Amino acid sequence: YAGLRTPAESFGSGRGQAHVPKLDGRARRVPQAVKGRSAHPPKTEKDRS
Amino acid sequence: TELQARGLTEKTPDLSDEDARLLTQRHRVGKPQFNRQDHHKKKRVSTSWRKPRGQLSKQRRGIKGKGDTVEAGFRSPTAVRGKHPSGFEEVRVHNVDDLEGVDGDTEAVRIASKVGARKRERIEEEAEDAGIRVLNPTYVEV
Amino acid sequence: AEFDADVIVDARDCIMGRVASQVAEQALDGETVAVVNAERAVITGREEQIVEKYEKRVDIGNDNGYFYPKRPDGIFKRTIRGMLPHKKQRGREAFESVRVYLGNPYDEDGEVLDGTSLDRLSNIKFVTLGEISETLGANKTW
Amino acid sequence: GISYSVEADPDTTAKAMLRERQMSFKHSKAIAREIKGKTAGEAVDYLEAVIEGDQPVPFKQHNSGVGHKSKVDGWDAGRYPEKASKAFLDLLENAVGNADHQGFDGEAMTIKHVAAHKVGEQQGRKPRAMGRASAWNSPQVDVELILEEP
RNA sequence: UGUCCCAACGUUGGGCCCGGUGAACUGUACAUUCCAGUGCGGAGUCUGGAGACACCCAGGGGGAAGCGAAGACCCUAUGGA
RNA sequence: CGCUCUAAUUGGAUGGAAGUAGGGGUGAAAACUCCUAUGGACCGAUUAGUGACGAAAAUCCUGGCCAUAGUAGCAGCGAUA
RNA sequence: ACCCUCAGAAGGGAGGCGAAAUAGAGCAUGAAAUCAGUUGGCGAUCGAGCGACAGGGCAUACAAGGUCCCUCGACGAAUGACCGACGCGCGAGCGUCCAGUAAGACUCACGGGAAGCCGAUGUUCUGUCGUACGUUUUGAAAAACGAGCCAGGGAGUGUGUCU
Ligand SMILES: [Cl-]
Ligand SMILES: [Cl-]
Ligand SMILES: [Cl-]
Ligand SMILES: [Cl-]
Ligand SMILES: [Cl-]
Ligand SMILES: [Cl-]
Ligand SMILES: [Cl-]
Ligand SMILES: [Mg+2]
Ligand SMILES: [Mg+2]
Ligand SMILES: [Mg+2]
Ligand SMILES: [Mg+2]
Ligand SMILES: [Mg+2]
Ligand SMILES: [Mg+2]
Ligand SMILES: [Mg+2]
Ligand SMILES: [Mg+2]
Ligand SMILES: [Mg+2]
Ligand SMILES: [Mg+2]
Ligand SMILES: [Mg+2]
Ligand SMILES: [Mg+2]
Ligand SMILES: [Mg+2]
Ligand code: NA
Ligand code: NA
Ligand code: NA
Ligand code: NA
Ligand code: NA
Ligand code: NA
Ligand code: NA
Ligand code: NA
Ligand code: NA
Ligand code: NA
Ligand code: NA
Ligand code: NA
Ligand code: NA
Ligand code: NA
Ligand code: NA
Ligand SMILES: [Sr+2]
Ligand SMILES: [Sr+2]
Ligand SMILES: [Sr+2]
Ligand SMILES: [Sr+2]
Ligand SMILES: [Sr+2]
Ligand SMILES: [Sr+2]
Ligand SMILES: [Sr+2]
Ligand SMILES: [Sr+2]
Ligand SMILES: [Sr+2]
Ligand SMILES: [Sr+2]
Ligand SMILES: [Sr+2]
Ligand SMILES: [Sr+2]
Ligand SMILES: [Sr+2]
Ligand SMILES: [Sr+2]
């Protein structure tokens, strides 16, 4: 759930901004965002044997 | 009173006629800079080569003036590829034992930068005695 | 005010464009040329049509400007400029090594360049630079 | 802050610095530029005349909208930055003082080196229409001066 | 009855110059342009010419198909309400 | 070709490691390497592995910063001080 | 610490400590964007994808590159003469012989020279070519879309099954 604990939402078109989820004027959740989730991180379910 | 470099600093290798010819060719022909397209137009774009991939890329389409594109045709002669400009083949050395098996008539040694002054001094005197030139010699006042 | 010309050309009864062409060629080769008796230089064709062309050039213009010469002096100098890359270093150097004069300011007579002479006994359809200038409204100072 | 950016022979030189001064950096560049090469004493008389309004300071780079001044030489735009001038007078007072404490003839020494450097901005905020606020900052300026025997 | 013919003079606050304070919009790059042409047919940047010594102040806004908003109109989506 | 960490084999470093700056050499190239200055403690190579492994771009994200600019505003309100 | 300066527990100067204060308080290192000062190159008559490749100017401590230039000679691919002689053409000019000769890129040897001198690096000038990049598109320099600049961040991953 790292990076997913936020209700951040995108403003969409209209304010001359990229459609990036933001919260309190701060971008979040998405992989390109600082403090956002890891896109394809290490996973516990992976069989390493 | 003056600085002098340790070792066989002026030594030259003995190359076949064909090798001297090819070494001379490599040096005469040279090659383009092969820097990345438009590296000079934007500071965030370094010089490190990257194949131009733009569909409309002028350099990619081979437009005269946009710079040469890396191709196998630019490779240097096998017989000389990699030689130090002197003609010597280089051998990387980290200690005195690395000097063993080195032919001072055909190879010159380059002491890794990490090596300290104490170990370098030993490597340098042993190399000279083995008739081996050291490309990056220590300069001492004599 | 004293022009050390290596060559003095006499444009009297000579086809303007042909002289201009040979003079530009010489100036590019490093020759300092003085063209003399410009008012007597000649241009072939029907006077009424030739005049219309020069009048149109005088009428053209705007804020950026299209300052076209009216004196035979300048008409000829401009004709030569159009045969020189006057905006390039070597071109401006050549152009500035050429000067055109009304009458002959030198003591020497000018030479008549080969192939530029017009034979009045064989031609009636031509006009004089001086005639064009007067028509254009110039002050016949010659 | 800065460190002297130029070498100085302690036996024939005296130094001084201003730190984080809250004044126009653009004005400081103009004043430094103008007094360099002058004698400390000349610099002082010049700055007092600037403050008095008798001598304008040439504004050669930060001159947008600046009206021309007839007394400006070889240039058109100039002004009378009194605040930064007074800061430079403090600097000169410090320099000449240090100079005299060392046995030198302070006022007679030449301003060998003098340069202003922006070390930061004191941040501020100003409320604006439509529910937004924008920056309203103060420049922070360091300035180095090196006096040298004639 | 200055809405108009047809505009004038004046008043107060700005504007302009000086001290102090001191933002924002906007910025691919280059950029002194003009006339024509060309080009995805609406070019400061391509071609041909013309013009063009650098910088600065004030101005009214012709152009940058100016800035500000992933066109509201129209169509399309095995979209929504 | 380059990056991380693991293992085996094998090396470097306070007689100055990594990094950074400027500079020399090699390779078609990814990139490798040396010199000098700074730095002041870690750093490789080969082989077999491991992968949160390579950016110029997404009106991309965060931080820092320049031009804009000593420019706009610090006048306008029946309370001109 | 002490001293000097200053309106001054400020700041500055000088000084003391330490291997180091360019370790002096968000105080290990200290990139880029970028700013001040300054060195080199260019610069107030001149033109715009900012360069690539050639070639000139000026600039250059050492180290890590050491080459380079001119006479002459040797070798000498494709190509390839002048002149002279003879013969054709209205003429521009051509043919035959001299002759596949002289010449001919590179490379080398002898003799002489260069050490800012050769390479290289910075900048600038000349020549040739040249309207970014990525994307959308039949067609992009585009008056189609994106970005102010830089650094860092930023996109084929796991389980199960199948081939
Ligand atoms: Cl290969
Ligand atoms: Cl005109
Ligand atoms: Cl031209
Ligand atoms: Cl006739
Ligand atoms: Cl500022
Ligand atoms: Cl050869
Ligand atoms: Cl893939
Ligand atoms: Mg995270
Ligand atoms: Mg770049
Ligand atoms: Mg103004
Ligand atoms: Mg409100
Ligand atoms: Mg509009
Ligand atoms: Mg839309
Ligand atoms: Mg509708
Ligand atoms: Mg519905
Ligand atoms: Mg091994
Ligand atoms: Mg990265
Ligand atoms: Mg890409
Ligand atoms: Mg403005
Ligand atoms: Mg620090
Ligand atoms: Na939360
Ligand atoms: Na598992
Ligand atoms: Na004619
Ligand atoms: Na005209
Ligand atoms: Na200026
Ligand atoms: Na003046
Ligand atoms: Na004046
Ligand atoms: Na009225
Ligand atoms: Na306008
Ligand atoms: Na944006
Ligand atoms: Na050069
Ligand atoms: Na697109
Ligand atoms: Na494009
Ligand atoms: Na277009
Ligand atoms: Na901005
Ligand atoms: Sr909308
Ligand atoms: Sr080292
Ligand atoms: Sr000719
Ligand atoms: Sr300015
Ligand atoms: Sr206005
Ligand atoms: Sr720096
Ligand atoms: Sr990644
Ligand atoms: Sr700013
Ligand atoms: Sr008031
Ligand atoms: Sr108001
Ligand atoms: Sr001290
Ligand atoms: Sr043009
Ligand atoms: Sr031959
Ligand atoms: Sr970045």
PDB file of C-alpha atoms (C1' of nucleotides) in Angstrom, chain D residues 124-137, chain E residues 22-26, chain F residues 68-74:
ATOM      1  CA  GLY D 124       8.382  37.265   2.243  1.00  0.00           C
ATOM      2  CA  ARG D 125       4.844  36.773   1.005  1.00  0.00           C
ATOM      3  CA  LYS D 126       2.303  39.303  -0.240  1.00  0.00           C
ATOM      4  CA  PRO D 127      -1.452  38.636  -0.391  1.00  0.00           C
ATOM      5  CA  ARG D 128      -2.948  39.136  -3.839  1.00  0.00           C
ATOM      6  CA  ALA D 129      -6.404  39.185  -5.381  1.00  0.00           C
ATOM      7  CA  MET D 130      -8.263  35.912  -6.056  1.00  0.00           C
ATOM      8  CA  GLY D 131      -7.129  34.067  -2.932  1.00  0.00           C
ATOM      9  CA  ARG D 132      -3.462  33.740  -3.824  1.00  0.00           C
ATOM     10  CA  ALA D 133      -0.192  35.070  -2.371  1.00  0.00           C
ATOM     11  CA  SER D 134       3.066  35.733  -4.231  1.00  0.00           C
ATOM     12  CA  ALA D 135       6.704  36.230  -3.289  1.00  0.00           C
ATOM     13  CA  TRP D 136       7.795  39.545  -1.726  1.00  0.00           C
ATOM     14  CA  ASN D 137      11.491  39.082  -0.963  1.00  0.00           C
TER      15      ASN D 137
ATOM     16  C1'   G E  22       9.186  45.296  -4.472  1.00  0.00           C
ATOM     17  C1'   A E  23       5.899  40.859  -6.990  1.00  0.00           C
ATOM     18  C1'   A E  24       3.402  38.149 -11.186  1.00  0.00           C
ATOM     19  C1'   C E  25       2.157  36.573 -16.176  1.00  0.00           C
ATOM     20  C1'   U E  26       5.467  34.364 -19.739  1.00  0.00           C
TER      21        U E  26
ATOM     22  C1'   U F  68      11.059  38.984 -16.847  1.00  0.00           C
ATOM     23  C1'   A F  69      12.648  43.796 -13.350  1.00  0.00           C
ATOM     24  C1'   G F  70      14.735  47.573  -9.914  1.00  0.00           C
ATOM     25  C1'   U F  71       9.456  46.651 -13.785  1.00  0.00           C
ATOM     26  C1'   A F  72       3.515  46.494 -11.883  1.00  0.00           C
ATOM     27  C1'   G F  73       1.624  47.858  -7.038  1.00  0.00           C
ATOM     28  C1'   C F  74       2.587  51.081  -2.416  1.00  0.00           C
TER      29        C F  74
END
